[PDB]
């Protein structure tokens with residue numbers, strides 16, 4: 001019985017999802033009221049469900065049963081409404097546009113590393129993996145420096161998974177919205193060089209984002225740019241520190257960075273599972289009776305370790321090529337921010353290993369502290385030794 005809120009999943013979700021992949025790769029469970037769900041752990045079956053038009057991302061198809069901007073973003077839409085919303089933001093994440101951010105991201109990395117070099121130890125989360133994506137997002141969205149401390153408080157509170165804090169989370173949502181509504185108003189009138197201005201002025205086939213569509217879009221982008229990108233950097237650093245022979249390869253040959261980032265995505269699966277998927281009708285898959293309204297959980301972490309698709313899947317190989325991981329999902333909803341996550345990872349891992357060639361883990365395996373989150377696999381802290 002899969003228990004995503006249980007101790008074993010918190011200790012190592014990869015080993016739980018892997019056991020399901022080998023023993024019961026299509027598994028019915030109850031997600032805690034309670035709601036029926038299916039856990040899909042093999043790569044081939046994950047692919048089939050990612051392409052299957054019997055699966056919706058919009059829970060209305062199945063109900064049966066403001067801050068409404070939070071659940072109206074494009075990742076909660078199917079075609080054709082998804083297609084329009086994606087075409088209105090797409091241009092913000094094309095290869096040149098994102099590549100053009102390189103110099104600014106390098107500068108943030110080097111500034112954070114200058115602070116870390118004042119000492120011979122650090123918590124990589126506090127010092128480097130958490131602040132870097134936050135500053136990148138802040139710069140990209142044009143959040144003035146005087147507003148960043150506050151923006152950090154809101155963005156942290158508004159994604160809290162603690163069920164009991166729901167009124168307080170809703171409040172932070174409302175405050176985030178009011179803040180961005182002021183920026184949107186101001187930039188519609190006087191546009192600047194930032195992504196809120198660019199979204200406000202985007203038009204495609206005669207259509208623009210409405211005020212509410214802007215709230216939803218900026219909400220989604222900010223949430224993505226923060227905790228999950230942080231987790232790439234944190235968990236990727238951890239994986240490099242646990243695999244010294246692969247760390248040394250990359251340190252000696254930084255041209256390996258592009259394959260290395262893809263391997264770290266595969267092995268660390270920052271989004272370890274994803275759901276928010278429902279069957280629109282009853283159907284059978286491999287003898288299993290899927291029902292209208294059943295939720296589908298896509299086991300990224302285990303799919304990324306499936307030996308039908310990856311050789312020696314449990315081994316970190318920073319030169320793995322090709323590497324057809326699904327860490328960014330697949331198909332319609334494939335991550336929009338993938339080039340930015342990849343650029344941040346490229347810059348950050350190279351920069352850290354250049355500045356601190358002697359970096360080493362300063363926490364025993366049993367003491368490593370992971371955040372409580374079913375879907376997002378992320379460290380609470382990451383103590384390291386930097387130098388003597």
Ligand code: HEM
Nearest residue numbers: 074075224225228229232274327328329333335336337341
């Ligand atoms: C390592 C970092 C990241 C990982 C692993 C990641 C992973 C994912 C995954 C798995 C999906 C598909 C979710 C589903 O289908 O349920 C997704 C979608 C998306 N991601 Fe990311 N993401 C990352 C960073 C970012 C960043 C930096 C941004 C933007 C700032 C972003 C923006 C989006 C958006 C807008 C979508 C929805 C796309 C659509 O519905 O068409 N992501 N991402």
